[PDB]
Write a protein that binds this ligand. Structure first.
Ligand code: HEM
Ligand code: LSN
Ligand code: LSN
Ligand code: K
Length: 463
């Protein structure tokens, strides 16, 4: 049958007993009772939860194809959210994902590499930092721009100026949708009502914000159709139009202008907020543990010097910095339950049978915070990624990107962003707090699965 769970009440399921304030903890509490595989009910739709490395691994990896579905919630439909990569399934997903991974290969869109676009953004980020002239500063915004401009460059070949109103407009919409999408009312509560949309104004705001962004993308597309050069694809859209020309005589086809739009919005969405937030917390953690900072800096000075930019080759000569970046992601656990999965067919799992179409919830927390792979997993300590001689120590428990067939598409892109932005900031600046290090809180604030950092200010002191 289904794995066992705590008894649900007719209709509301186990709903009125979950800590919507911190679902992760709730899951972890239950696991304390029902073990690593347990069942829950969300107003009648069963959801199997997987907790702990073993169960996540043999699910996502060993039965990878079977667990490769994306769980669908009303919201997916309420915000027209299932038409690109993140919220797709079947043929559509496989085709668009696979093509998207090929095109975001470092050298997948022409002679200009992804690393080179990031490298440029690292320089612009540092310039903007300088322009603050060491005065206090809330970097929430700037750190939001950098990644966004990276997605822009990957998709439009254009980067913007931190003050180009056009950019500032896009950011705003992005930021609005993100903040909205992050409300518990929208993520959870509204997904109890499968038929009735209880927040129509909101979904309407979301959709309008989407339309503005799709409409802007469609302008770029036109500009790209007129300037096409079949031997010199320069960005994601180029590649996507070329794949379209190849699918001519393969209709109906997954690749259309509609899907390009939807895929591009997914990319803007997914490639801007999580990185941005990871960087924003990273700076905060570095203010709090300034001996970590000084160690990153000793590595940078010695391996990279100050003449040139950091580049990805340096990361292998910088085991301590790399440990720092890993540990930031492990410690933050920014997507504690990944995104929802669904089984792709009827399956046997351990003692139990899971019927095709059942939502699966992966507790990334339980892997990231394994208190044996990572002693005192709730403390920030880069030593969790270092061996006895201060060499880099990999961990099969390092899944901030999830695992298996759905592993984040931006995994390599996030990794370049973090390493190059962080090392470029710390190459050109020291960090200074207002309040005393040993004072401010670095523990993630969390909501509707939402993980945000407190407000804080700091100064960027030129080196
Ligand atoms: C630190 C930054 C990031 C983290 C921690 C992160 C993490 C994740 C996670 C946990 C998933 C869900 C995997 C699952 O379905 O089980 C995911 C999916 C995804 N991420 Fe990221 N991500 C990050 C940045 C990015 C970036 C920069 C992009 C750029 C394109 C991106 C694009 C995606 C996409 C498209 C998916 C959907 C994959 C699919 O369902 O096939 N992410 N990410
Ligand atoms: C109905 C079509 C209007 C669409 C829309 N475009 C934008 Cl732009 C605005 C700003 O509020 N809006 C309206 C708006 C109205 C109230 C909400 C909202 C805010 C907080 C808590 C619940 C509500 C809500 N949403 N739907 N019903 N009540 C959000 C969007
Ligand atoms: C102006 C456009 C902003 C981005 C955007 N707004 C809308 Cl509505 C969509 C539909 O998915 N999207 C695409 C989307 C894809 C992934 C996310 C995402 C980003 C960081 C952290 C969590 C999520 C998320 N979205 N849903 N569940 N988790 C946000 C937006
Ligand atoms: K209303």
């Amino acid at each position: 049958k289904l794995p066992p769970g705590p008894t649900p009440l007719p209709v509301i399921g186990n709903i009125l007993q979950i800590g919507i304030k911190d679902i992760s903890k709730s899951l972890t509490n239950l696991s304390k009772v029902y073990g690593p595989v347990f069942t829950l009910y969300f107003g009648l739709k069963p959801i199997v939860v997987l907790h702990g490395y073993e169960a996540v691994k043999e699910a996502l990896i060993d039965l990878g194809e079977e667990f490769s579905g994306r769980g669908i919630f009303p919201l997916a439909e309420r915000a027209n959210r299932g038409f690109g990569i993140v919220f797709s399934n079947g043929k559509k997903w496989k085709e668009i994902r696979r093509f998207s991974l090929m095109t975001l290969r470092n050298f997948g869109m022409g002679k200009r590499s992804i690393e080179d676009r990031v490298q440029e953004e690292a320089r612009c980020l540092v310039e903007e930092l300088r322009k603050t002239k060491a005065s206090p500063c809330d970097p929430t915004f700037i750190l939001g721009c950098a990644p966004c401009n990276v997605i822009c460059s990957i998709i439009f070949h254009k980067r913007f100026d931190y003050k180009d109103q056009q950019f500032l407009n896009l950011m705003e919409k992005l930021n609005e949708n993100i903040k909205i999408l992050s409300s518990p009312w929208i993520q959870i509560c509204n997904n109890f009502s499968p038929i009735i949309d209880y927040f129509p104004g909101t979904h309407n705001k979301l959709l309008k914000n989407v339309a503005f962004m799709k409409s802007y993308i469609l302008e770029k597309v036109k500009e790209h159709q007129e300037s096409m050069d079949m031997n010199n694809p320069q960005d994601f859209i180029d590649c996507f139009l070329m794949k379209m020309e190849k699918e001519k005589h393969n209709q109906p086809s997954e690749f259309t202008i509609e899907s390009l739009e939807n895929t591009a919005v997914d990319l803007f969405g997914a490639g801007t907020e999580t990185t941005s937030t990871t960087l924003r917390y990273a700076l905060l953690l570095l203010l709090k543990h300034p001996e970590v900072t000084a160690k990153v800096q000793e590595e940078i000075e010695r391996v990279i010097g100050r003449n040139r930019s950091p580049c990805m080759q340096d990361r292998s000569h910088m085991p301590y910095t790399d440990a720092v970046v890993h540990e930031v992601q492990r410690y933050l656990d920014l997507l504690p339950t990944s995104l929802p999965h669904a089984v792709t067919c009827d399956i046997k799992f351990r003692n139990y049978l899971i019927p095709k179409g059942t939502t699966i919830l992966i507790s990334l927390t339980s892997v990231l915070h394994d208190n044996k792979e990572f002693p005192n997993p709730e403390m920030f300590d880069p030593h969790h990624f270092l061996d006895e001689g201060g060499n880099f120590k990999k961990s099969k428990y390092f899944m901030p990107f999830s695992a298996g067939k759905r592993i984040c598409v931006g995994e390599a892109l996030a990794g370049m962003e973090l390493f190059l932005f962080l090392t470029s900031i710390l190459q050109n600046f020291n960090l200074k707090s207002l309040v005393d290090p040993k004072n401010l809180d670095t523990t993630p604030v969390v909501n509707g699965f939402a993980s945000v950092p407190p407000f804080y200010q700091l100064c960027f002191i030129p080196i």
